Structure formats: structure tokens, C-alpha cells
Amino acid sequence: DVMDVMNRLILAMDLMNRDDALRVTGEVREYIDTVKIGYPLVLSEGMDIIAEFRKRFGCRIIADFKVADIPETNEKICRATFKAGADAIIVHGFPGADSVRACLNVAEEMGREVFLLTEMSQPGAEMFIQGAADEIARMGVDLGVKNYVGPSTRPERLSRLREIIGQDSFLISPGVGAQGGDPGETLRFADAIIVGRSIYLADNPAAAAAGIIESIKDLLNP
Amino acid sequence: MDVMNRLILAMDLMNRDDALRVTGEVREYIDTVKIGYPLVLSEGMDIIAEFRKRFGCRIIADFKVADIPETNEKICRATFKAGADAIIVHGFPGADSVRACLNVAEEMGREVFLLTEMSQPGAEMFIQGAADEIARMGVDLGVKNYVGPSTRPERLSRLREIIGQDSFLISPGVGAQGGDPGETLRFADAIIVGRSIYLADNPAAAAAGIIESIKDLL
Numbered sequence A: 001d002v003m004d005v006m007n008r009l010i011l012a013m014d015l016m017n018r019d020d021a022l023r024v025t026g027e028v029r030e031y032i033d034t035v036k037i038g039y040p041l042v043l044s045e046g047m048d049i050i051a052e053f054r055k056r057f058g059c060r061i062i063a064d065f066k067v068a069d070i071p072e073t074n075e076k077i078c079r080a081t082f083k084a085g086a087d088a089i090i091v092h093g094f095p096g097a098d099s100v101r102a103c104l105n106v107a108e109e110m111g112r113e114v115f116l117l118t119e120m121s122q123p124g125a126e127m128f129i130q131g132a133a134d135e136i137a138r139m140g141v142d143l144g145v146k147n148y149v150g151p152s153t154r155p156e157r158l159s160r161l162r163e164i165i166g167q168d169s170f171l172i173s174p175g176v177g178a179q180g181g182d183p184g185e186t187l188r189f190a191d192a193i194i195v196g197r198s199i200y201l202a203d204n205p206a207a208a209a210a211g212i213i214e215s216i217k218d219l220l221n222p
Numbered sequence B: 001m002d003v004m005n006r007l008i009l010a011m012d013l014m015n016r017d018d019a020l021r022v023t024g025e026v027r028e029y030i031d032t033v034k035i036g037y038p039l040v041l042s043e044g045m046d047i048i049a050e051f052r053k054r055f056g057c058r059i060i061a062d063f064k065v066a067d068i069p070e071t072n073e074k075i076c077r078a079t080f081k082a083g084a085d086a087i088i089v090h091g092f093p094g095a096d097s098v099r100a101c102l103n104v105a106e107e108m109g110r111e112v113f114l115l116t117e118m119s120q121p122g123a124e125m126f127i128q129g130a131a132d133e134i135a136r137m138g139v140d141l142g143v144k145n146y147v148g149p150s151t152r153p154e155r156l157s158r159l160r161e162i163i164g165q166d167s168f169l170i171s172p173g174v175g176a177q178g179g180d181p182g183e184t185l186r187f188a189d190a191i192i193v194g195r196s197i198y199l200a201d202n203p204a205a206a207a208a209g210i211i212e213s214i215k216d217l218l
Ligand SMILES: O=c1cc(O)n([C@@H]2O[C@H](COP(=O)(O)O)[C@@H](O)[C@H]2O)c(=O)[nH]1
Pocket: A012, A014, A038, A064, A117, A119, A120, A121, A122, A149, A150, A151, A174, A175, A176, A177, A178, A179, A194, A195, A196, A197, A198, B067, B068, B071
């Protein structure tokens, strides 16, 4: 029982104006039913952008808010985000168990889902996050987290994350394309890949998405 | 940065009418408001300009920025476009992610505050062990503004030691989370206070009371 992500491909819609974001998302609609909306778009166009995407595309919405505050503020953020119509929210694990639990409690109450971000894809992740990541992931499992985010750019780390969370957990992975991660290699471990710039900055986003999907065709579910 | 009464209001009410009313009630006591995601996600980024129009306060956007460098740049740009004077950024994601924020702040005439250790009990699990190194990274990157926890004065003092007396340090966890205003101001330039003021029966009296308790420190 996990979200059914069409073509194992999630669009990271980080364009910052409504017109372009709507155009590109519409162009790739036949390939992707799950869109990750983050703060670049939300802070530029408002939380109503979630409403507009639901109206226009009917896509599933993951709010990539990397929630990273104290328990009381995390609760408020999750409440506001689910109220606006997000299906799921992404939460940092590094602030600790209480901060994560606050998000899980709201998701449970409100009938939505939390994704736990355990390690990140940027080079700077090696400084502090990488050393804590196995324990952050183990903490997530202990807390009952079922959905996780881990980095395409570090296949050995993504593999270990998959081991810790088990085969039944749901794992999505960014860093594919622009940051250097390979779609097929990433799907060895992740249930779905997240792709932003490779698609949304392409002259033909639909062709870019179709091309990624063609490259992973033998990895799709019947 | 010159914060009136060394007191920053954490305005985490989630509706515009209450947030504006309560801020107005305490306006004589403050000139600096921290606005975070509870208010922004409920009422929109336009709330920042509205606070400036009504109160002419400085605005710190407490967005705990914690993404990759490319996304951090976008978040900072959108935030400063909305009129924030400063933004709070996590150090835990590493130097590149912090640098991305420093760059946009310089471009738009704003400040970055580096959050190095957090105030909640869970901060002990992963953040605390990294916090001194995160602070040293801030120093190496030229960060001048920092955030550290009222709930652990010995850790707040250590942060002040690392960054030096010339850096600017603000500190949440005062009141509701158990931190003491006067003790916190031994180390921090200003205290951040949310619930003790905004959930008080009488927010103005609450703010006035806090200020009375630290009057010899002003
Ligand atoms: O470790 C992580 C976690 C993320 O959410 N992301 C997010 O995934 C997306 C990556 O987009 P892109 O394909 O353009 O690199 C961005 O929205 C980014 O904020 C990431 O790149 N690395």
C-alpha cells in the first residue's frame, strides 16, 4: 500500500512563475501523475498554487517543505500544508525524533503522509548529514515512518538507506539528471525518481520526460 | 542590527487578523518581528509587506532554509522579493547550501542568520554534536549573524565563544520552552519570544513584563 506513481517519475516543479510552471506541468501530464511542489514555487505564487495544480491536472502533490523546526512549529506547518491540499509533506530528520513525531502525528490525524529526508544529494551533505544518516533512517523506522527520500548522487548511500528501511518502505530519490544521477541505476533502490531541471528547462519537457521513461522502460510495473 | 529592547517577537499566529492585532498591541515594545512558515503558509508572503506598511518593523524570515544550493538560492530570492530583511538558514546541510544563501543576501542587501544548534530536546540527537563545527563553518564563511538555544545556556555561551563578541546572536526558547530572558541575554544580543507573548491573555502586559525583568540589561 504505497502511492502509485505513474512511470516511477516525479516532477520537481521548481519554476517560480505560475504561467511557466502550469505550462510545463501540463505538457508532461500524460507521463507523470505525481508532482513535487517546493518553496521556490510556493513562496512565489502562494499555497493556492497547490489548489490550481489539483484543478488543472489532478496530479498527486508532494509538498517539499523540508520541515525542520521545533515540534510545535512543525505541527503548524504540517497543518497549513495539508489544509491547502497537499497529499504528503517532506520532513528533515536531523532535528530529531520529537520534531519528526510532531509531523507524523499531524499526518495521522489529517489522513496524509510524511516522507522523511535522511541524507541529501549536494556535496555539502558529506559534512554533517552523511555521518548521521544511518541513524536518522533507523530512527524513522522506529517511529513508523513508511516513506523516505535519499540521494541519487550517492548510489552506495541510497543502497544502504534501502537496506535500513526495508523493501516494503517507499523511497523516492532526487539528483537525477542535472546533478548527475542516472535514472536506471537509481531505480535499483528507489521506487521513484525525482527529476526537475532535466525536464522543466528542456526545450521540449514532454520529449525530455518521454526520453527518461524510454530509458527505464524495462523497469516499469505491469 | 539594532533590536529595540533586545526583544524579537516570534509571530506564529496563523490568521492575519489576530497576527496584525497582537503585533499592534505590542508595537511600542518592539521593532523587529520574526515571521515564519506558520503565518506565511496560512496567509501568503504578502503578509511581510503588510507588516512593513503597518508597523515599519524589520522582518526576519524564519524559513529554516535547508535545501540544496540551487533551491536555497531560489528560496532566498523569493523571500527577499517579499521584503524580508533577513533569513534564517540551517547549517546542517553543509557549506555549499549556506553559501548559496549568503550570495543572494549580498545581491539584495539583506542578512543571513545561521542556525547552529536548536532548542528542542531532539536537537541532542544529531545537531548538538555537530553544532560547534557548524559555528566554525559560519566563521570560515564570513557569517556574522547566528541563532542558538535559550534552553541550553552553556551551549549558547559556547556558541558566543566560537563566534566572538562582534558577531550578532539571537536566541529562541525563552518562556514557553523554559529559557530565562536575563540569563539568555548574558550571551545573546536579543531574545526571540513567541507564545509567552502571543498566547498571553494580555500580550502587551506580557511583553512589558519581560522587558521589566531585563531592564538593567537594556
Ligand atoms: O537531497 C535532496 C533533496 C531534495 O528534495 N532535492 C530536491 O529535488 C529537486 C532536484 O531537482 P533537479 O532535478 O533540478 O536537480 C529539487 O527540488 C531539490 O530541492 C534535492 O535535489 N536533493
